[PDB]
Design a protein around this ligand. Structure first.
Ligand code: NDP
Ligand code: CO
Length: 309
């Protein structure tokens, strides 16, 4: 159980390296160390800025013969200012150029939120999203072979279903926050009903992000299962997601933990311990405050997540 199968037929590696908040030079060595440790899945985004760095790590891996391009699952993401249909493929070509790849394995709409091209997230830059029109342009990138799969990120059940209803090419993935403290049961059920894969971001509760306030790995339920099974809390957290049928993007810079985050395959969480996850209090850690605003199409956090708060 080291892969999940997308609705296009392609296999996605269950564990990928998260690369948000990986700084100058830090991310390249993390991509390199993770791939030689055995990672076959790297999750990127243009808005993180580090795609050039990531490209150089991948080019080095290929030159040293650690992997071939086809061995790797590479994801990047369309940022909120490129939602206009003619801007979408141009944004993909830029991400491709910087990563020095001919194709991505997965290309995601980063947020269901739009701003004018080349502007920052501030209320005068807000444009009302037109996700069907953006998706139409994502589909042409898929048809042109530039993205083997397309999908979305931070889409609620309602919003994912709204897109499925109008789409020709179904979103392959909804990449959302998902971890023992935010288990996404509703969206998980809805993804199984539609054939959409769910990738968990912040699978550890993102313990190092200041403003999120993450203590997922200190939950007594996780610490206990960790002791009873001989594993770290982080391993038990990632395993929980994998056992739910979710891929996971642990972000890390420490080589020891990068390899620990891959040891989630050949052992199980028993049914009797697994049921105890129902006893973990639930709080969404990444609320999306930066796009909830009296002038945004989302005026409340409820409007952004469609009650999935
Ligand atoms: N909107 C979107 O689509 C979003 C996508 N993402 C993606 O998902 C990825 C993961 O989310 P992220 O917020 O990075 O948080 P994670 O849940 O992956 O946790 C990250 C933090 O946990 C620490 N950590 C890593 N491994 C371990 C371990 N074995 N034990 C204890 N602590 C550990 C890391 O520090 P250290 O480096 O020192 O190990 C880091 O501070 C991102 O990198 C990004 O690619 C993230 C946010 C939003
Ligand atoms: Co259909």
């Amino acid at each position: 159980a080291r892969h999940f199968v997308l609705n296009t037929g392609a296999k996605i590696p269950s564990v990928g390296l998260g690369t948000w908040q990986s700084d100058p030079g830090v991310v390249g060595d993390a991509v390199y160390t993770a791939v030689k440790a055995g990672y076959r899945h790297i999750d990127c985004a243009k808005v993180y800025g580090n795609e050039k760095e990531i490209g150089l790590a991948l080019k080095k891996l290929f030159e040293e013969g650690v992997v071939k391009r086809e061995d790797l699952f590479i994801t990047s993401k369309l940022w909120n200012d490129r939602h206009a249909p003619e801007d979408v493929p141009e944004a993909l070509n830029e991400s491709l150029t910087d990563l020095q790849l001919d194709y991505l394995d997965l290309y995601l709409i980063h947020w269901p939120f739009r701003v004018k091209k080349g502007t920052n997230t501030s209320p005068e830059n807000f444009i009302t999203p037109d996700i069907p029109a953006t998706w139409g342009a994502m589909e042409k990138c898929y048809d042109a072979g530039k993205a083997r799969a397309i999908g979305v990120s931070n889409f609620s059940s309602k919003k994912l279903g709204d897109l499925l209803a109008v789409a020709r090419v179904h979103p392959a993935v909804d990449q959302v926050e998902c971890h023992p403290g935010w288990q996404q049961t509703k969206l998980h059920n809805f993804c199984q009903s539609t054939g959409v894969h769910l990738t968990a971001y912040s699978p550890l509760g993102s313990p190092g992000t200041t403003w999120m306030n993450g203590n997922v790995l200190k939950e007594p339920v996780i610490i206990s299962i960790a002791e009873k099974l001989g594993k770290t809390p982080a391993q038990v957290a990632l395993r929980w997601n994998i056992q739910m049928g979710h891929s996971v993007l642990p972000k890390s810079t420490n080589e020891e933990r990068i390899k620990q985050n891959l040891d989630v395959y050949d052992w199980s969480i028993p049914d009797d311990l697994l049921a105890k996850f129902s006893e973990i209090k639930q709080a969404r850690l990444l609320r999306g405050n930066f796009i909830v605003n009296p002038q945004s199409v989302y005026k409340t956090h409820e409007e952004l997540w469609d009650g999935e708060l």
